[PDB]
Structures are given as structure tokens and as C-alpha cells.
Amino acid sequence: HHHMVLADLGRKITSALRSLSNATIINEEVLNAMLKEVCTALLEADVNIKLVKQLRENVKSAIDLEEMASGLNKRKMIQHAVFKELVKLVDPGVKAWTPTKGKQNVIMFVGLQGSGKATTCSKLAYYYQRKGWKTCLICADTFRAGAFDQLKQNATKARIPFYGSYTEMDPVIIASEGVEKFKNENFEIIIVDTSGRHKQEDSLFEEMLQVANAIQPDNIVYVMDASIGQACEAQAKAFKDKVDVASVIVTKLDGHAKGGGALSAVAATKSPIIFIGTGEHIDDFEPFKTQPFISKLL
């Protein structure tokens, strides 16, 4: 109830919908003033103006205040048209990849520097661990001088089987031998962590494709820092074009107003968002279901 990670965006939208429903008479002047408050609320959440303009057109096209046939309550329709369009804004419109029970699902992780990818790997492995999946963790991370220590102690947190090496230098052979070990051990969720000290987007795609060709994963997850706002559009579009199955986890949605713009930016690229990072705890991780996400927002 507006305790959401997008609460400041929620307070502004509800007040616009609350003011509209409480209008003595509903007309186009009251409707236009409501969109102005919502369209501004989205922009202050760093939503791209192109997305905010398209939202306004979709709302006015769905509403036909001039010819209102019997039985229709406009005020309640005005609010759902806003609600229904807020769902489109954060929905990629593409069915995400899901693991198959009884099969062996290899999932590889990629992410830039300062994205929380290393800890986000632990949350997904623990997520499937509480759901009854036989899960594991592989740290194919080279040259972080502590990436394996972080997994060694983070896998300790959720008692998750982990395989990695301090000394071995090729990430391709660490992930391959890691997937080979756990595949023959009948694991259903095999999570491979790649290196996180990548600053530019091209350096990520080199290691990403090196490790992917060897282990042949069933899914590749891009972990994005939402604190960059609508600038996620460049990252989302680039990563999706260079993989077969693309999925995006968004972390650091809290502590900044740019979270709502990052979600709509990745959704605009038609990249499936599969999970949310909302804070620092290990159970602070939840899948991205758009309709419950927007309904609780309002």
C-alpha cells in the first residue's frame, strides 16, 4: 500500500486518479488535467518522454467521453485505462524463459561494474532453493581477487553447492568443468557467474560469448543497475541483440527516483524482466509480474 520501491511515483499517480474520481462532473478538461499530473509524475521518475507521450495518446484513444454508451462508468474506466497503460509501460510484452522441472537448466550471469551482480547470483540461487529446485553456483570469475571468496562465503549463507577455483585462469574451462560436475550430479538449476569488473559494454560481450559457446546455457541474465534511469535503453537493446534467450534482472530500484524509468526503458526494448532487486537482504528478491507490480503501486 504505497510501501513499494516506486512509492513516490505511486503517491503522485493516485492523487491524480483520486482527484479525478472525486470530480463533481467528468469531462475532457478534468481528464486533460489528470494526464498532466500523471505524465509529469512519470517524467520525474525518469521515464523517457517518448514513452510518456505514447502513454497519453493510448489513454485518450481508449476513452470516448463524447459518446458514452449506457452502463459504462467513465471515472472507473478513466482509472483502469491509466492502470492498464501503466502495465504496458513496464511490460516487455514477451514471455520470459522458465526452467523445466526434471531437466538441467544452465543459467549464465552477465553484468557491468557496480551492478551488484555477484550478490544477485546468490539471491536467485537461494530463490530456487526455497522452491525445491536442486540448485548450485559456479564462479567463473577471473581477476577480481575476491570474487571466489565472496561466493565461497555467500554460498555458505544458503548452504548452496558451489564450484570455483582461485588459481585456474581460463573462465571458459572453470565454467565448463563446473557445469560438467553439476550436470552429472543431476542439478536442475546451474548458475554460472562471470566477471563483474567490466565497465564498457563491448568488453562484457567478449567474455559473455566466450563462456556461452562452451557451456551452452539455457538462459543468459543481464543484471542492470537501475540507478542510471532511462539510460538502460542502450544497455537493454545491446544485450538483447547479442543473445538468443535474454532476461534482465534489475537491482537498486530503491534509494532513487529513476527506478520507474529504468523498468519502462528495458520494457521498451522488449527484453523480458524476470526478477527485481529491492534491497540488500537475500530474500529481498522477487519475480517481475507486471500486473501485481502496478496494482500494488496504485
Side-chain angles (χ1 to χ4, degrees), residues 39-101:
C39 291
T40 295
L42 299 168
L43 291 169
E44 298 185 336
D46 205 12
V47 182
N48 184 236
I49 179 185
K50 167 189 182 179
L51 304 176
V52 182
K53 280 186 176 178
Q54 177 61 87
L55 172 134
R56 180 197 175 94
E57 170 191 88
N58 294 338
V59 176
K60 298 211 68 173
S61 183
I63 302 163
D64 309 73
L65 283 190
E66 295 133 331
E67 203 192 39
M68 234 63 232
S70 316
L72 243 58
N73 192 323
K74 20 212 176 187
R75 287 176 174 83
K76 278 172 147 188
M77 180 203 59
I78 309 280
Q79 293 179 231
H80 183 91
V82 172
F83 172 87
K84 172 178 179 175
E85 214 55 40
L86 289 172
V87 174
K88 283 201 219 172
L89 200 59
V90 299
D91 192 273
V94 167
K95 294 181 179 179
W97 175 91
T98 51
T100 296
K101 255 294 180 179

Side-chain angles (χ1 to χ4, degrees), residues 186-235:
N186 298 287
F187 279 75
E188 320 182 70
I189 296 288
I190 298 168
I191 295 175
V192 189
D193 184 21
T194 60
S195 65
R197 285 178 188 166
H198 298 293
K199 180 176 174 176
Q200 297 300 337
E201 42 220 309
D202 271 300
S203 87
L204 196 80
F205 295 153
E206 301 304 330
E207 177 193 28
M208 178 185 75
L209 300 178
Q210 290 290 128
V211 186
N213 283 335
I215 64 181
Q216 300 282 21
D218 292 297
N219 182 60
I220 298 180
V221 179
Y222 196 16
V223 182
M224 281 200 232
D225 181 10
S227 72
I228 62 178
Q230 62 185 290
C232 296
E233 213 170 299
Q235 271 133 90

Side-chain angles (χ1 to χ4, degrees), residues 18 23 31 34 63 72 93 95 107 116 121 125 146 166 175 219 226 253 271 277 286:
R18 190 188 309 113
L31 168 61
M34 185 273 302
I63 302 163
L72 243 58
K95 294 181 179 179
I107 301 170
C121 293
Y166 310 90
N219 182 60
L253 272 187
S271 296
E286 35 210 310

Side-chain angles (χ1 to χ4, degrees), residues 244-284:
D244 313 83
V245 171
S247 297
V248 170
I249 293 180
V250 165
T251 71
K252 289 166 235 303
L253 272 187
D254 43 315
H256 60 87
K258 310 180 183 182
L263 290 170
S264 50
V266 183
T269 66
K270 289 193 167 190
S271 296
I273 310 175
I274 54 170
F275 294 97
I276 303 180
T278 321
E280 291 274 78
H281 303 92
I282 177 159
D283 74 337
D284 194 84

